[PDB]
Design a binder for these strands. Structure first.
Lengths: 190, 150, 84, 83, 129
RNA sequence: GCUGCAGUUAAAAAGCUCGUAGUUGGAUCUUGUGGAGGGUUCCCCGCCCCUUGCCUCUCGGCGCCGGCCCGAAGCGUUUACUUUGAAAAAAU
């Protein structure tokens, strides 16, 4: 059925029912009818970016996301064509569990998997945004005031698929995690 | 440095930063598992499976195509051996030197190198016994050693 | 080395000269290549430091011989690296 | 050095090496002060204006003063950030 | 073998400062090293620094300003109580007017002057002046 | 000589190697905006994901026109460390 987004009580919102309508109606034409199958989108949002414009974030459940990425190169190109001059990103619906030692209830009967840690979730969210391109390496600069900046290196092939979206990647990752990031290309790579 | 020699050489592998599978690789996770299961029926140890796959097929690191290390892939199907493969190789080397010393009792270098092999067996067995890989009653014996590898 | 050379930006000719474990970030010198032979022409993949005596899908007696460094090809039509 | 009334109490304040940020002592007879002429931008001619540097004796005797004077002259406008 | 990583980091900085070098490379990195460097930087003894990811514990490059006379480690991490801290700063510091002992406490890693304001004891890590 | 000594030539490193007890042991698993005291961001409240981490009873007072709320209790994986209470003759 339509309005697939969010748990009970949260569901009726105009923007998020609008984006999920715009996704689920697209299986009705013969090309994407071969490869969409009413697969779950868990949420969507429309958010501001540094140029005073707007961008959208689409949230995908983990066991479905390995199938979305295989068609995303056409599926996002169709959505970015249909919406009013917007930029789009797909990201995983990851959960974080709290620290067992003196910051949560804890017992021997179940152990917190390291795949549910805050560090393993925040550094996985960084790989979803850039998807048409691959991370070549990271560096972190500590300033004299005690703040941090992250420098990300992107592969030199596939520049044409991400150079016009680095300005939305910084604003989206800032709003998902609270941290400043710059996206850059290497001098050379082995 | 090496544990029983004065040498301190540096040779080893160096993995790349990029953990991803490359776009040119035609293989897929469950077909790599079937090739591992076929190679195990020939009696190949895990260390030999990884070189046959690296040399003659596209898979540089099986752990990057399939999310598991290849001894776990064998244990989950019941294909794994009853003695760990590095402990097996040390025991096979100890019986080869013992077959030499029965007729060559003047070879005092061979007598010295046998102490350095069997003390390296004792150090490795003591590790595996604490992690429940071996029974608490497991013991290497110079008379029994030939029956552990035949 | 002078008193003031910066350590964060080695030139690629400074980085390609040094040992694989002693670079700023580690990387192998080995590579994958695709290889082809006369008489039967099904293309195959080989690793440049192979230990195995490789036999092709074309069933020829030897595709390459192992060696103390790089393996040597039997005068095959390609030594072309794969890009990634 | 100042006291709780805010007045100064040193005999003198000693100079520091331009390359290295360490104090040059009263008996460091291997140390130097260098002085270099500025030129006008229309005709390349001396206008009487100049720039100065001071170098530690320990950096001179290890052979590092030539590269230190060059880095200082590239940090100021004189060598113009190309070579 | 390498029994302690913080002792390598400070000995490596201390040898580079005495040769007059403008940068130094520290390897392996650690959570303890990044928190110790931050205390020297906040008091003005070193410049800013950058961390390299390599998937094996990481590395740090540090910028040097020529102000540092020494930095060092006390190897057994002895416990200290507020009544006994006077004896340690009488032993390790060059004057009552400058230099700092660094402590680890349940309120965090910090300067021995901050531990008196926060009314807390801890374990000794090292010092700088 | 713990703080704090020494062992090429002044006194002094087992001829050499293995090895049980003893001492020592690599990296990794939750943060910035808002208010008070104070500053021009950080220490106390409440928050992106959890703020005593959970929970729902029943013997037992509170808030109001039965029902729903907020102080005990089960207790937060076990210890060292540190800070605070209590309790320890007088004379010196």
């Amino acid at each position: 059925s339509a309005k697939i987004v969010k748990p009970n009580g949260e569901k009726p919102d105009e923007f998020e029912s609008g984006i999920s309508q715009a996704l689920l109606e697209l299986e009705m034409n013969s090309d994407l009818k071969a490869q969409l199958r009413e697969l779950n989108i868990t949420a969507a949002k429309e958010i501001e970016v540094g140029g005073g414009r707007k961008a959208i974030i689409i949230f995908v459940p983990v066991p479905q996301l390995k199938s979305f990425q295989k068609i995303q190169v056409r599926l996002v190109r169709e959505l970015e064509k249909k919406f009013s001059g917007k930029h789009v990103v797909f990201i995983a619906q990851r959960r974080i569990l709290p620290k067992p030692t003196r910051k949560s209830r804890t017992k021997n009967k179940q152990k917190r998997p390291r795949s549910r840690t805050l560090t393993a979730v925040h550094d996985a969210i960084l790989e979803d945004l850039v998807f048409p391109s691959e991370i070549v390496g990271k560096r972190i600069r500590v300033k004299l005031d005690g703040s941090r900046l992250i420098k990300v290196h992107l592969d030199k092939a596939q520049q044409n698929n991400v150079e016009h979206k680095v300005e939305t990647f910084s604003g989206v990752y800032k709003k998902l995690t609270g941290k400043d990031v710059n996206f850059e290309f290497p001098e050379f790579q082995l | 440095g090496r544990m029983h020699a004065p040498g301190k050489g540096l040779s080893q592998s160096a993995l790349p930063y990029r953990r991803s599978v490359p776009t040119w690789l035609k293989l897929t996770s469950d077909d790599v598992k079937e090739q591992i299961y076929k190679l195990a029926k020939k009696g190949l140890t895990p260390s030999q499976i990884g070189v046959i796959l690296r040399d003659s097929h596209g898979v540089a690191q099986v752990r990057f195509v399939t999310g598991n290390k290849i001894l776990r892939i064998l244990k989950s199907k019941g294909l794994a051996p009853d003695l760990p493969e590095d402990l097996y190789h040390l025991i096979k080397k100890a019986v080869a030197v013992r077959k030499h010393l029965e007729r060559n009792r003047k070879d005092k270098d061979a007598k010295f190198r046998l102490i350095l092999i069997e003390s390296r067996i004792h150090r490795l067995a003591r590790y595996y016994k604490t992690k429940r890989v071996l029974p608490p009653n497991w013991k290497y014996e110079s008379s029994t050693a030939s029956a552990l590898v035949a | 080395m002078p008193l003031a050379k910066d350590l964060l930006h080695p030139s690629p000719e400074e980085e390609k000269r040094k040992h694989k474990k002693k670079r700023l970030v580690q990387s192998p010198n080995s590579y994958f290549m695709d290889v082809k032979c006369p008489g039967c022409y099904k293309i195959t993949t080989v690793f440049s430091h192979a230990q195995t005596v490789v036999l092709c899908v074309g069933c020829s007696t030897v595709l390459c011989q192992p060696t103390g460094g790089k393996a040597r090809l039997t005068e095959g039509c390609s030594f072309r690296r794969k890009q990634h | 050095m100042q006291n709780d009334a805010g007045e100064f109490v040193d005999l003198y304040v000693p100079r520091k090496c331009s390359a290295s940020n360490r104090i040059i002592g009263a008996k460091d007879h291997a140390s130097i002060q260098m002085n270099v002429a500025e030129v006008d931008k229309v005709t390349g001619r001396f206008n009487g204006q100049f720039k100065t540097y001071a170098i530690c004796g320990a950096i001179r005797r290890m052979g590092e003063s030539d590269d230190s004077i060059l880095r200082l002259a590239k940090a100021d406008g004189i060598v113009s950030k190309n070579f | 073998v390498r029994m302690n990583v913080l002792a390598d980091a400070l000995k490596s900085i201390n040898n580079a400062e005495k040769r007059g070098k403008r940068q130094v490379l520290i390897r392996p990195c650690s959570k303890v090293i990044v928190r110790f460097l931050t205390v020297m930087m906040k008091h003005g003894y070193i410049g800013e620094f950058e961390i390299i990811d390599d998937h094996r514990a990481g590395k740090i490059v540090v910028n040097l300003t020529g102000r540092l006379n020494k930095c060092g480690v006390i190897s057994p991490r002895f416990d200290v109580q507020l009544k006994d801290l006077e004896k340690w700063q009488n032993n390790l510091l060059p004057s009552r007017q400058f230099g700092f002992i660094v402590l680890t406490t349940s309120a965090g890693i910090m300067d021995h002057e901050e531990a008196r304001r926060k009314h807390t004891g801890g374990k000794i890590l090292g010092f700088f002046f």
